Automatic annotation (TrEMBL), chain I:
Its main location: mitochondrion. Accessory subunit that is involved in the functional assembly of the mitochondrial respiratory chain complex I. Complex I has an NADH dehydrogenase activity with ubiquinone as an immediate electron acceptor and mediates the transfer of electrons from NADH to the respiratory chain. Pfam families: NDUFB10. It comes from Ovis aries. It is found in: Mitochondrion inner membrane. Belongs to the complex I NDUFB10 subunit family. Keywords: Electron transport, Membrane, Mitochondrion, Mitochondrion inner membrane, Respiratory chain, Transport. This is NADH dehydrogenase [ubiquinone] 1 beta subcomplex subunit 10. Residues 1-24 are annotated as: Disordered. The keyword Hydrolase does not apply. Disulfide bonds join C110-C122. Residues 1-12 have a biased composition (Basic and acidic residues).
Length: 459, 128, 155, 111, 122, 79, 87, 220, 171, 177, 62, 65
């Protein structure tokens, strides 16, 4: 895993010694080279995972997340170079360094075999994200959003540290392979109940769970575009990955202890979806859609069946790609019209036809159109939850309506109808925005051809 | 004779059947004159700053910003916890959660009881 | 935009009501705020609760699709009452009449279908007869087990 | 057996060809509706042949030509089942679509 | 359709129901009643892949009609004689079915007459 | 580019049902001032329209003649 | 489909349908003939004239513009404005 | 599903009785046809339903082409109260629309007769719901009613369109496509009904007042 | 090609064409045109490709795994032997999944081949499918997403305990 | 009750609007033209019977009763012209109505295909920017203090100038572009 | 160049997917399964050559 | 050439369209008459319907008691 950490940490001299006019070109070129290099993690075996040393390993669950992260960094570099065009050079280099540090922390978080190292860099991912949100956010409410995000995460995740140190003192090790071969059942006691709660609540907050999701429609809105990409495409999936890793040790208490939380998502993904029917804000609409999809992921993890696990992996990857693309489209509209409200700019298909095509395709992939991997993940979670209980299909099917009921709604008021008369600064679409949309979307449709590389470690 | 038309929430009264339209008092004339004056002022401002050949951009609307700030950022400071808000929050917040928890717990308890007694048909069920 | 243009708390004194009506570009006697039940409405006005289909379709609006004017205080549920969504336009017949007629028609059809299901219609013929013990082997019956031989006689 | 499957999948591939033709376009197409109408008429003939073969013999076939995804016990492949229903419904739909597209190229000329 | 009105508006003691039939033994009132005999063995009709609904007592003309349809391609309109034989045989089977229905109805009528006669006599 | 109209005096309501309704209105003490506007509707090629039975049996004569010669040919060609 | 219109064509149309009115003498009216001033018509007759205009040209004139057209040339100007004639 | 199909076809036919938009009338017509397909599925006649699909597609599409021809010839005027006297003005559209209406109603030895009537032949002599059979017969009468309503209001009578007349149907594409679907709606039902293999036992022994139920219902 | 013992198929029985009319069927003419215009160039191109492949030959092999002692002879909390036992168990699990897949493919092939007599002519395939599904369900079901050899051993031990107890009740 | 020219609707205007909508609905119920003529002349006689009424409250009561009559006698679906609101092809071509300022964003390569049109566009923009300050200075000196009381706009008063606020009503897109 | 639509859009796909079906699909087991041909009393089998025996004499109704 | 738009009068018709319309109507009526002449049974009935009242008790095997 040293072959990816070292070039990522050498990206900082690359971005700090470059000229004032070629930082973007050099950083995008070398991050695309690292994304190409990332494909050597597909050497997965049907029985054994890929173990590199005592410190790092990568099974078939971490590999799609690593490839997605190192593919996502150049996309952020291309997106965040227009609202920072007038910025000072030193602050531009500091922003690029924050992005590089965030990628380095993420790609060594996804590969740590030891759990306290995973916790340490899982919380080291807080600092660059928070700095980006509270520094390069636009309006006044970025400070409150940063406070909410940081304090929800830390107040949920300090008992996780306490529980992990207790595990290290009790079992004797925190290596994931040793814990895979030394796992003991957890009996029925109040101590084990709070053990389960301390292990679960950090990832509950970072998923987010309904009722603990109040930091999402702030931090996903006040942040800049690259902050929106990392907020919607990696960190939520990082919480899901941690949940998948740590649910191994919490058997068989989970078989009843997951009983409330499933309801807190099974109803929750209804309510937040209904919020998208009556949202006056485009970015808030995308954030609440992310809440609903990740609640579906929560249910899939908590019922702990194989089909649900592969559905959760495919759903996480597909939702990350789709949410990043939707945030890019909303940011392009916000750059053109200088307001975030959805009803201000209407009828943009008459002026911007190809961006309307990208909008249509992104909305179609949002509402789980087959044979996309969004539909594959949603379908597999549906099969597993039907095996769990029958009436759950109702809670699925109604959601299958409401999702489309906002997605096409998001397609209409932003693209269809009569255009706004007084808005006359609708410039034609740049090559950069179209290239960003294509680089977001074409990997998703190509992954629809060969989905078996994202179907989890038990495929 | 003819059936009288009554209003509803989803079917309002027609304008022509409204008695208040036929009231020709001078106070109604003053009210309509003031409303027309307000509308003419706003229209004149909008089409004065809208027909400008120099301006390129968005003619911003204070009413839209007012509506968005009222809909999103003004809900909490104007909220006071009383009996109505607390009863509505408890009725619509933890009601469906308890209902669905009881439904799913009952169904899965019955299913587990049937499964462990060898009663439920699970012949070809090998994918779960 | 300035801080005194945003909505504020619920007005109680008449001068605050006058300043609120001045802020929202409407007459003082036409400005009725929402009741102060602590639901977060604040000083936003309570509009007459009509859909955008009820507006004049021939008067030239600033937004012709939305049927709306620049600077007009928009409804709290304008995102609900657009022409793509729920309409409140008057109907030729009464609402309760429509509900009663539709419910009665549905109930009558359901009851009549139940009555017809209880009392079916058939033909005055005997049951259809198949050879070889009602096709015992062709119906998936195992050949090792011998069934009861049934037979059909001519009439 | 070899004529059957080849002609049926030729009908399918011939139908999906003009989508790639318009997606890989650079110029202004020299009456693309005529190209689509000709393609669909030719596909109607190409699907009329195995319908005639089924009428003569009574052949039903299943082509699981591309294995897609093995979800442990479950196996999902690109499988086409052509029986009475599919083989008698494809050419009727093709004939109707041929007439509809000719009416469309007259009716939607000003678009 | 007067049988439906007889059963529904009159009484159902005489009118036979179509759910289960017959409610009488075939040797009752029929000395030396012989059974219907197939022409088609089960093996040849199995290899002809007939529908299980079509695997009835008159499958011989069905097999003949299918052989005509397979052998006369592409001249698809000159196998009318074989299908005429087939649906004539099916008409005869329908006649047998309604004959059995009338036999059941008359036996139930005789039951009602006999039981009322025995109730009045004693 | 250039459009030419017929004479405006040629439209008369006589014979059409507009004459009947004008006479009925006169019998009721009224008048119809717009009969000449749509006097064109009942005059010309738009007059003498067929009924349902006439429209249903359109082309029945030639079809019956074709049926006659076809059945005669099928009679003769068999023997 | 949809043959083009012209100003003298639509003027000929409105005059041609105007001389078919039994309340109007065809030998007196011109293109600047007022209805209740130069022809002695009525407001209801003006309403019927506007409905004849709508049934002639196939599009409905709104009432707030129907209460303003008082001469045949005004109807010509309104139809020319609404149909964008003489490009 | 038999009850649902009968309810659907009766409801849609009764809605189509007093409609005034031509495309709305044809929409309710094809929904009533789909209800009849649901009905004949519900009485264990699936191959008859498939034959009815293949039969119905031809004349339903052809009726829509005729409707589009009348719409284009009258400058996008879809209301049925503003059209009339089009029997002689547009003769090919008139002929195709008349043949399509006759095939939809169930005229003998057209395409619909080879499927739709047979459905009623299984709807009477089978163990069915009585109410469903009664309402599907009433629905058949309603299909006849709205078909001749379309014929009378669209084609017969006197004109009601505006004074400028731009009636034209002389284009090779429209004439050729209407001709192809006219040949289809004339002969394809016969061809398919005589070409498909028997997948069931046909029911033909039935009384005379059950054999001619559909034709009498259509006539009345 | 494939092996016919793993994938069984009955020898086919094709009837001879004995026409009763004089109209020539277009199927024979179209078939002759198919081996004229299509089969000959395709076979020529395949012959050229096969000659080019016979010019340069090399081989590949099916990987063979020896038997390592399973979890029943592994000391507890001794990762060195339990790792090998778990790897062997997972390899076996994948192999059994593909075996059940093969039997399902056999059943579907039998149903499609038999057509309208499938519910009589495919009794053996259905019985084989039922047997392999019963054994798979008794071997691998209800383990969870975190399945291991220890959970399978515990399930088997519970099943044998239940079977022995039920035998003891009826003895 | 919502007009750009007048603040309110007079009694005669209400009567004329009622006559218009009643005649339209009667034409909807009476599809054949001669029957429509009979009942339209009957409605004209019924409106002419109470024409010379001088008591205003009696006229208002008759108007309210006639409104009740009309609402009882509506067509459930009346005839709408295809381009009027509620019609079959209302606002159908609004996807084709591209505003002209998009022509400012055209590339010079595609601007070279229409030289004379863009020269005329340049002279039109020059005329607009030459007359804009004259239009606004006319607007300030014409309206009274406290804002305009009506939405009506003044015309071009002097010679050589253009009416105020003319650009978005002259350069509006065609009905069928 | 008069009827190259019958060459590029018809014959080349027939060639390509006939190669694909003959040398890559049917080489794998159970990819293409066809319903076995119908067997009647009175015809001849090509594969082994047995004449199937004819059927029992009809007790004719007509 | 094309068809010029007439005003308040019957529009111009080609001979081809009316000829084809009359030909296809005659073809439909010929088809209906020919198929009713040849088949004549799918509309009126195929086989006689024996009413049950004329069947004797011997063939039904009804015991006399
Ligand atoms: C008794 O009449 C048995 C027939 C089935 C029940 C009655 C069906 C009545 C409707 C169908 C016949 C209509 C004849 C015009």
């Amino acid at each position: 895993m040293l072959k990816y950490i070292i070039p990522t940490m050498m990206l900082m001299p690359l971005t700090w010694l470059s000229k004032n006019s070629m930082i973007w070109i050099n950083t995008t070129l070398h991050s695309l080279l690292i994304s190409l290099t990332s494909l050597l993690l597909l050497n997965q075996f049907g029985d054994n995972s890929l173990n590199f040393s005592l410190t790092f390993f990568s099974d078939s669950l971490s590999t799609p997340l690593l490839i997605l992260t190192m593919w996502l960094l150049p996309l952020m570099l291309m997106a965040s170079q227009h609202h920072l065009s007038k910025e000072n050079l030193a602050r531009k280099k500091l922003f690029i360094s924050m992005l590089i540090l965030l990628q380095l922390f993420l790609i060594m978080t996804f590969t740590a075999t030891e759990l306290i190292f995973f916790y340490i860099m899982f919380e080291a991912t807080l600092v660059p994200t928070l700095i980006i949100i509270t520094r390069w956010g636009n309006q006044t409410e970025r400070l409150n959003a940063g406070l909410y995000f940081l304090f929800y995460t830390l107040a949920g995740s300090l008992p996780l540290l306490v529980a992990l140190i207790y595990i290290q003192n009790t079992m004797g090790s925190l290596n994931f392979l040793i814990l895979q071969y030394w796992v003991q059942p957890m009996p029925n006691s109040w101590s084990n109940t709070f053990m389960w709660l301390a292990c679960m609540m950090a990832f509950m907050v970072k998923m987010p769970l309904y009722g603990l999701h109040l930091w999402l429609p702030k931090a996903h809105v006040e942040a800049p575009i690259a902050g929106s990409m990392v907020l919607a495409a990696i960190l939520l999936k990082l919480g899901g990955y941690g949940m998948m890793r740590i649910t191994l040790l919490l058997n068989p208490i989970t078989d009843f202890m997951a009983y409330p939380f499933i309801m807190l998502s099974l109803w929750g993904m209804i309510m937040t979806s209904s919020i998208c029917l009556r949202q006056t804000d485009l970015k808030s609409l995308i954030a609440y859609s992310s809440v609903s999809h990740m609640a579906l992921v929560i249910v899939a993890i908590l019922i702990q069946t194989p089909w649900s696990y592969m559905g959760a992996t495919a759903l996480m990857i597909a939702h990350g790609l789709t949410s990043s693309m939707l945030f890019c489209l909303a940011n392009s509209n916000y750059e053109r019209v200088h307001s975030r409200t959805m009803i201000l700019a209407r009828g943009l298909q008459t002026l911007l036809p190809l961006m309307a095509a990208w909008w249509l395709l992104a909305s179609l992939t949002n509402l789980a159109l087959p044979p996309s991997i969004n539909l594959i993940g949603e379908l597999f979670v549906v099969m597993s939850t039907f095996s769990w209980s029958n009436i759950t299909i109702i809670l699925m099917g109604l959601n299958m309506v409401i999702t489309a009921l906002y997605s096409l709604y998001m397609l209409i008021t932003t693209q269809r109808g009569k255009h706004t008369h007084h808005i006359n600064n609708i410039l034609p679409s740049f090559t950069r925005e179209n290239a960003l949309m294509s680089l977001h979307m074409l990997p998703l449709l190509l992954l629809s051809l060969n989905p078996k590389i994202i179907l989890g470690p038990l495929y | 004779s003819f059936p009288k038309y009554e209003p509803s929430r989803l079917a309002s009264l027609p304008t022509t059947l409204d008695p208040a339209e036929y009231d020709i008092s001078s106070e109604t004339r003053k009210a309509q004159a003031e409303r027309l004056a307000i509308r003419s002022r706003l229209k004149r401002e909008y089409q004065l700053q809208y027909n400008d050949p120099s301006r390129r951009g968005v003619v911003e609307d204070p009413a839209l910003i007012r509506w968005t700030c009222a809909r999103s950022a003004n809900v909490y400071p104007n909220f006071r916890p009383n009996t109505k808000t607390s009863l509505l929050g408890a009725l619509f917040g933890i009601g469906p959660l308890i209902f669905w928890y009881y439904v799913f717990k009952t169904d899965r308890d019955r299913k587990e009881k049937l499964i462990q007694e060898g009663k439920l048909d699970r012949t070809f069920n090998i994918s779960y | 935009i300035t801080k005194d243009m945003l909505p504020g708390p619920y007005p109680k004194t008449p001068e605050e009501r006058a300043a609120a009506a001045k802020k929202y570009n409407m007459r003082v006697e036409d400005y009725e705020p929402y009741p102060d039940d602590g639901m977060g409405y604040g000083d936003y006005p309570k509009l007459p609760d009509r859909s955008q289909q009820e507006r004049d379709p021939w008067y030239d609006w600033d937004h012709p699709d939305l049927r709306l004017n620049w600077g007009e205080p928009m409804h709290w549920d304008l995102d609900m009452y657009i022409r793509n969504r729920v309409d409140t336009s008057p109907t030729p017949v009464n609402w309760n009449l429509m509900c009663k007629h539709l419910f009665g028609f549905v109930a009558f059809m359901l009851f009549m279908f139940w009555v017809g299901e209880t009392y079916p219609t058939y033909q005055p013929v005997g049951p259809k007869q198949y050879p070889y013990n009602n096709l015992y082997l062709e119906r998936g019956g195992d050949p090792n087990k011998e069934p009861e031989p049934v037979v059909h006689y001519e009439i | 057996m070899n004529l059957f499957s080849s002609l049926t999948l030729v009908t399918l591939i011939l139908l999906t060809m003009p989508i790639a033709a318009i997606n890989f376009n650079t110029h202004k197409f020299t009456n693309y509706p005529l190209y689509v109408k000709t393609t669909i008429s030719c596909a109607f003939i190409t699907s009329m042949i195995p319908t005639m073969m089924f009428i003569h013999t009574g052949q039903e076939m299943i082509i699981s030509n591309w294995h897609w995804l093995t979800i442990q016990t479950l196996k999902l492949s690109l499988s086409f089942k052509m029986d009475f229903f599919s083989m008698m419904f494809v050419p009727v739909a093709l004939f109707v679509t041929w007439s509809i597209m000719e009416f469309s190229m007259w009716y939607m000329h000003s678009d | 359709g007067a049988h439906l009105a007889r059963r529904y508006l009159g009484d159902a003691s005489v009118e036979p129901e179509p759910l289960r039939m017959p409610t009488f033994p075939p040797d009752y009132g029929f000395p030396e009643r012989k059974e219907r005999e197939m022409v088609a063995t089960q093996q040849e009709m199995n290899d002809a892949q007939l529908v299980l609904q079509q695997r009835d007592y008159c499958a011989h003309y069905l097999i003949r009609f299918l052989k005509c349809k397979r052998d006369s391609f592409p001249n698809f309109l000159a196998c009318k004689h074989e299908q005429h034989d087939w649906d004539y045989c099916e008409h005869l089977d329908y006649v047998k079915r309604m004959k059995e229905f009338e036999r059941e109805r008359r036996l139930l009528q005789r039951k009602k007459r006999r039981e009322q006669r025995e109730a009045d006599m004693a | 580019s250039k459009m030419e109209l017929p004479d405006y005096k040629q439209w008369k309501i006589e014979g059409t049902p507009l004459e009947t309704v004008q006479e009925k209105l006169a019998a009721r003490g009224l008048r119809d001032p717009w009969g000449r506007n749509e006097a064109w509707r009942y005059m010309g090629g738009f007059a003498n329209n067929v009924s349902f039975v006439g429209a249903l049996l359109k082309g029945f004569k030639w079809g019956f003649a074709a049926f006659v010669v076809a059945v005669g040919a099928e009679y003769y060609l068999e023997s | 489909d949809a043959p083009p219109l012209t100003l003298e064509g639509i003027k000929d149309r409105v005059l041609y349908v105007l001389k078919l009115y039994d309340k109007i003498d065809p030998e007196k009216l011109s293109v600047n003939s007022h209805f209740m001033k130069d022809l002695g018509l009525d407001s209801l007759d003006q309403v019927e004239i506007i409905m004849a205009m709508e049934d002639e040209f196939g599009f409905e004139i709104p009432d707030i513009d129907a209460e303003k057209l008082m001469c045949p040339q005004e109807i010509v100007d309104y139809i020319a404005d609404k149909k964008d004639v003489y490009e | 599903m038999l009850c649902l199909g009968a309810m659907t076809t009766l409801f849609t036919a009764m809605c189509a009785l007093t409609q005034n938009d031509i495309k709305k009338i044809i929409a309710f017509s094809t929904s009533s046809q789909l209800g009849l397909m649901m009905v004949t599925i519900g009485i264990n006649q699936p191959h008859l339903a498939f034959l009815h699909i293949c039969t119905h597609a031809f004349f339903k599409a052809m009726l829509f082409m005729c409707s589009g021809s009348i719409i284009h010839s009258l400058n996008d005027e879809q209301d049925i109260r503003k059209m009339g006297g089009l029997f002689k003005a547009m003769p090919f559209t008139t002929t195709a629309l008349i043949i399509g209406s006759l095939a939809l109603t169930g005229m003998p030895f057209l395409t619909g007769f080879y499927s739709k009537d047979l459905i009623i032949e299984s709807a009477n002599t089978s163990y069915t719901n009585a109410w469903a059979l009664l309402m599907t017969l009433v629905a058949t009468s309603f299909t006849a009613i709205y078909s001749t309503r379309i014929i009378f209001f669209a084609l017969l009578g006197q004109p009601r369109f505006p004074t400028l007349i731009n009636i034209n149907e002389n284009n090779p594409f429209l004439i050729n496509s209407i001709k192809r679907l006219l040949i289809g709606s004339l002969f394809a039902g016969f061809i398919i009904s005589n070409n498909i293999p028997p997948m069931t036992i046909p029911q033909m022994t039935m009384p005379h007042y059950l054999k001619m139920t559909a034709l009498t219902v259509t006539i009345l | 090609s494939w092996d016919k013992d793993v994938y069984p198929e009955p020898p086919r029985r094709t009837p001879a064409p004995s026409p009763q009319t004089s109209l020539p069927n277009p199927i024979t003419y179209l078939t002759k045109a198919f081996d004229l215009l299509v089969d000959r160039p395709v076979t020529l191109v395949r012959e050229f490709i096969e000659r080019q492949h016979a010019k340069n030959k090399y081989y590949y092999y099916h990987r063979e795994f020896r038997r390592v002692p399973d979890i029943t002879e592994c000391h507890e909390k001794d990762v060195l032997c339990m790792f090998e036992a778990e790897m062997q168990w997972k390899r076996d699990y994948k192999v059994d999944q593909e075996i059940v897949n093969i039997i399902q493919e056999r059943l579907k092939a039998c149903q499609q081949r038999e057509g309208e007599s499938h519910r009589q002519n495919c009794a053996k395939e259905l019985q084989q499918f039922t047997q392999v599904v019963k054994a798979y369900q008794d071997r691998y079901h209800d383990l969870g997403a975190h399945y291991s050899a220890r959970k399978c051993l515990a399930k088997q031990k519970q099943r044998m305990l239940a079977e022995r107890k039920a035998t003891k009740e009826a003895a | 009750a919502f007009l750009p020219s007048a603040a309110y609707l007079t009694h005669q205007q209400k009567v004329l609007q009622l006559y218009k909508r009643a005649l339209r609905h009667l034409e909807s119920r009476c599809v054949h033209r001669d029957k429509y003529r009979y009942f339209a002349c009957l409605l004209r006689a019924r409106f002419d019977e109470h024409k010379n009424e001088k008591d205003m409250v009696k006229a208002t009561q008759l108007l309210r009763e006639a409104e009740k009559e009309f609402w009882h006698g509506q067509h459930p679906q009346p005839y709408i012209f295809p381009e009027s609101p509620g019609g079959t092809s209302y606002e159908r071509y609004e996807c084709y109505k591209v505003p002209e300022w998009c022509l400012d964003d055209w590339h010079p390569s595609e601007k070279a295909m229409y030289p004379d049109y863009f020269a005329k566009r340049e002279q039109w923009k020059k005329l607009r920017r030459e007359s804009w300050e004259r239009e606004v200075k006319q607007l300030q000196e014409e309206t009274p203090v406290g804002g305009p009381r009506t939405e009506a706009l003044p015309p071009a008063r002097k010679q050589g100038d253009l009416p105020p606020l003319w650009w978005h009503i002259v350069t509006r897109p065609r009905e069928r572009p | 160049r008069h009827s190259i639509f019958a060459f590029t859009h018809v014959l080349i796909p027939v060639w390509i997917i006939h190669y694909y079906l003959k040398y890559h699909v049917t080489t794998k087991p159970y990819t293409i399964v066809e319903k076995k041909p119908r067997i009647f009393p009175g015809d001849t089998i090509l594969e082994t050559g047995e004449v199937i025996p004819p059927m029992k004499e009809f007790p004719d109704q007509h | 050439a094309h068809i010029e738009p007439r005003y308040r009068q019957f529009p111009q018709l080609t001979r081809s369209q009316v000829i084809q319309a009359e030909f296809f109507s005659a073809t439909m009526w010929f088809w209906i008459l020919w198929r009713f002449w040849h088949d004549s049974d799918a509309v009126l009935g195929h086989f006689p319907y024996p009413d049950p009242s004329q069947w004797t008790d011997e063939e039904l095997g009804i015991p006399p008691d």
